[PDB]
Structure formats: structure tokens, C-alpha cells
Amino acid sequence: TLNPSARIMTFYPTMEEFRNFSRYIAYIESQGAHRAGLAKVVPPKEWKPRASYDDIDDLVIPAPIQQLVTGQSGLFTQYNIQKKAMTVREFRKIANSDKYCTPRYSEFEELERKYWKNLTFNPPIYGADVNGTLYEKHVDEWNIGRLRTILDLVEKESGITIEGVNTPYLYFGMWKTSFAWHTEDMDLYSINYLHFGEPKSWYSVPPEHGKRLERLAKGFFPGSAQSCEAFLRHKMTLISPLMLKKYGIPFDKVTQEAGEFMITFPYGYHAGFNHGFNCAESTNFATRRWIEYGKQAVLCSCRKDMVKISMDVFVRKFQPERYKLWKAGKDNTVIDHTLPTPEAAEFLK
Amino acid sequence: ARKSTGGK
Numbered sequence: 001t002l003n004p005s006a007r008i009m010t011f012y013p014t015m016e017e018f019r020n021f022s023r024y025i026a027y028i029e030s031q032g033a034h035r036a037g038l039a040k041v042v043p044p045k046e047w048k049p050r051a052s053y054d055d056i057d058d059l060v061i062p063a064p065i066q067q068l069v070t071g072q073s074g075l076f077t078q079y080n081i082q083k084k085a086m087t088v089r090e091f092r093k094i095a096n097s098d099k100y101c102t103p104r105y106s107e108f109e110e111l112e113r114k115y116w117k118n119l120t121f122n123p124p125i126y127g128a129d130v131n132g133t134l135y136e137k138h139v140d141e142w143n144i145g146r147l148r149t150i151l152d153l154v155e156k157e158s159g160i161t162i163e164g165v166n167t168p169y170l171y172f173g174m175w176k177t178s179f180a181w182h183t184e185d186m187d188l189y190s191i192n193y194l195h196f197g198e199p200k201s202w203y204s205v206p207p208e209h210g211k212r213l214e215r216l217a218k219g220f221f222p223g224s225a226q227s228c229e230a231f232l233r234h235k236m237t238l239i240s241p242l243m244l245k246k247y248g249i250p251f252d253k254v255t256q257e258a259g260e261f262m263i264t265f266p267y268g269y270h271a272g273f274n275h276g277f278n279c280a281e282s283t284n285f286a287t288r289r290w291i292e293y294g295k296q297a298v299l300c301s302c303r304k305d306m307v308k309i310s311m312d313v314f315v316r317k318f319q320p321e322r323y324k325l326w327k328a329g330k331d332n333t334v335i336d337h338t339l340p341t342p343e344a345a346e347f348l349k
Numbered sequence: 350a351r352k353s354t355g356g357k
């Protein structure tokens with residue numbers, strides 16, 4: 001009904017609207033935001049998660065990754081090679097040096113063409129997956145370390161911590177560092193805050209067209225598909241927007257600036273790249289709507305110790321009527337990707 | 350397990 005084009009929406013909450021995170025996600029879903037797979041939320045001007053970023057040069061990036069990319073004609077495979085630990089001061093120097101710094105350009109479309117032209121050359125280092133938060137401890141609004149969503153049931157009931165999923169990660173970017181096409185682990189939501197630096201650019205495919213992207217990718221990389229159903233979960237697959245266009249896959253793009261949040265929605269495929277030196281913070285989260293996606297997520301089996309969350313506690317608490325059916329393997333619920341989460345009822349009444 | 354940016 002809402003957002004029939006499934007385009008990426010941008011929201012400008014007041015501080016009063018901003019305060020309750022889970023409630024605001026329910027709101028943006030009542031406006032159809034989830035249909036795009038990706039949304040931007042620009043927080044109120046008064047809001048700041050940290051007073052200054054002057055004190056982080058000594059922060060250690062324990063496992064920076066050099067991103068080797070192979071391919072041509074809009075189809076690539078990215079190999080992430082772990083380098084030795086380095087400090088943020090050491091990373092920033094390399095990021096801003098003549099060898100790695102952002103090229104000169106006029107319009108964004110020019111920078112994007114240079115990205116897709118040059119991504120296999122001069123492999124960059126991405127300071128990815130760093131355990132930590134740059135939020136100050138007093139910040140109660142949209143705090144990536146404590147969003148208070150039902151994803152908290154995992155740790156609360158089982159004691160299980162899954163780094164980056166129910167804890168925060170930092171990402172130190174340089175020019176041409178990339179994230180491959182993926183949905184989140186267990187098809188969760190994600191939140192991404194750009195603390196400082198140059199922009200991060202995103203592509204998204206509506207969840208309602210996700211299966212179409214998978215079929216396409218399977219055809220483009222038939223060997224990877226035969227060795228693992230969920231091979232996109234390896235996060236090694238890059239596909240240009242020209243290729244998506246050429247094969248009729250609906251998608252949108254958006255650029256995230258310093259100070260801005262992005263939200264990804266269950267089964268919303270996304271990929272992108274950093275423009276230059278920057279720092280993002282991110283984690284996963286859930287709403288009641290996610291539980292069915294969690295139940296039905298197609299997971300990677302071919303690699304050891306991949307992220308798998310027991311859905312039992314969620315089905316018992318929030319779907320008691322279906323619990324026995326689901327344990328018997330007879331729960332044939334079909335997901336409607338257009339429907340907002342039940343918690344949005346407040347805003348739809 | 351943990352979340353990862355990608356593999357090789």
C-alpha cells in the first residue's frame with residue numbers, strides 16, 4: 001500500500017520522535033520504508049553521540065583487511081586479506097596518502113564511474129570489524145551498544161554474545177574500500193552510523209526482489225552456487241548497478257554523509273563503498289516482523305562457525321500458536337515483504 | 350561465531 005515504488009526514503013525526526021528507537025523503526029515501516037530494503041534517518045541537529053573524535057588515534061585496528069578484487073564487466077569477486085594490527089593514526093596516514101586518497105571529481109556520478117573502473121587496481125585496506133563503540137556512555141538515544149530491541153532475548157535467555165550482531169563494530173574506511181552484496185546474518189536489520197569523515201555510498205535491492213538478485217548471481221557465478229546455496233553470505237560478490245540494470249533487477253542508491261544513520265531491513269540486499277577516510281559504527285537488531293525471516297533464513301553451511309541464532313525462544317514468546325507446528329516442520333507461513341511490523345499498528349490506526 | 354565484512 002505505502003511506498004509502492006519501493007524507493008529509499010529519508011526521515012528527519014524531531015528529538016521527541018528520535019528518543020524511542022524501536023518505536024521510530026515501527027513508524028518508518030508504517031510509511032513503507034522497509035520496502036526499499038534501506039532507509040536514511042537524519043538525526044536532530046541537537047543530537048551528538050560523542051563530544052570529540054580527537055582522542056582515538058591510539059585505538060587499535062587488530063585485523064585490517066587488504067581488499068583484492070578480481071573480475072570485469074560489472075562482475076567481481078573480492079578477497080579480504082588480513083594484515084597486521086595497526087593504530088587509527090597509522091591507518092589515517094595511509095588512507096590520506098597520495099597512493100590511496102580519494103581522486104578528484106566533480107559530480108558523484110563521476111566518483112561512482114571511477115569506483116567501478118578502478119576497483120581491481122591498487123587494493124586498499126579496510127579497517128573493518130573492530131569491536132567497539134565511539135558513543136559516550138550517557139547517550140540514551142539510538143545508542144548502537146544498547147538499542148533495546150527484541151534481539152536482546154538472545155543474550156538475556158541464553159547468555160550468548162555474537163560479536164557485531166548483538167555487540168557493536170567500528171569500520172575505518174579509505175577510498176574504494178567496499179562491502180559486497182549481502183543481507184544480514186539471520187536476515188536481521190542493521191543500523192549504521194557514520195561518525196566522521198568522507199561519505200559511504202550504498203546500493204539496495206527491495207526485499208520483494210531479493211530472490212531475483214540471487215537467481216541472477218547464481219547464473220553469474222554457477223560454481224560458487226553449486227558449492228554453497230547461500231554463497232552471497234560469503235560477502236565476496238560485487239555486482240555493478242549497470243549489470244543490475246542490464247538484467248532488470250530493481251534497485252536504488254543513496255549516499256550517507258557524516259552524522260547520518262542508515263537502516264537495512266530483513267532480506268534487504270545491499271552493497272557499497274567508502275569515498276575516503278571515514279569511521280562508521282554498526283550492529284544488528286530485530287523487530288517482531290523479523291522472527292519469520294529468522295525462521296526462514298537460508299544460511300551458509302560450507303564454512304565453519306557461521307552466525308546461526310536459535311529461533312526457539314522467539315517462536316515460543318511471540319508465536320505460541322505456531323510453536324508445535326513449527327517444531328514439526330509444518331509451519332508454511334509465506335512472508336509478505338510489503339507488510340510493516342505489528343508494532344506499527346499504533347501509527348496505522 | 351562473529352559477524353564478518355567478508356572472506357577470502
Ligand SMILES: O=C(O)CNC(=O)C(=O)O
Nearest residue numbers: 179190191192264280282
Ligand atoms: O559499512 C560497511 O562496510 C557495510 N555496512 C553494512 O553492511 C551494514 O551496516 O549493514
Ligand SMILES: [Cl-]
Nearest residue numbers: 221222223224
Ligand atoms: Cl563460479
Ligand code: NI
Nearest residue numbers: 183184190264
Ligand atoms: Ni550489511
Ligand SMILES: [Zn+2]
Nearest residue numbers: 228300301302
Ligand atoms: Zn557457504
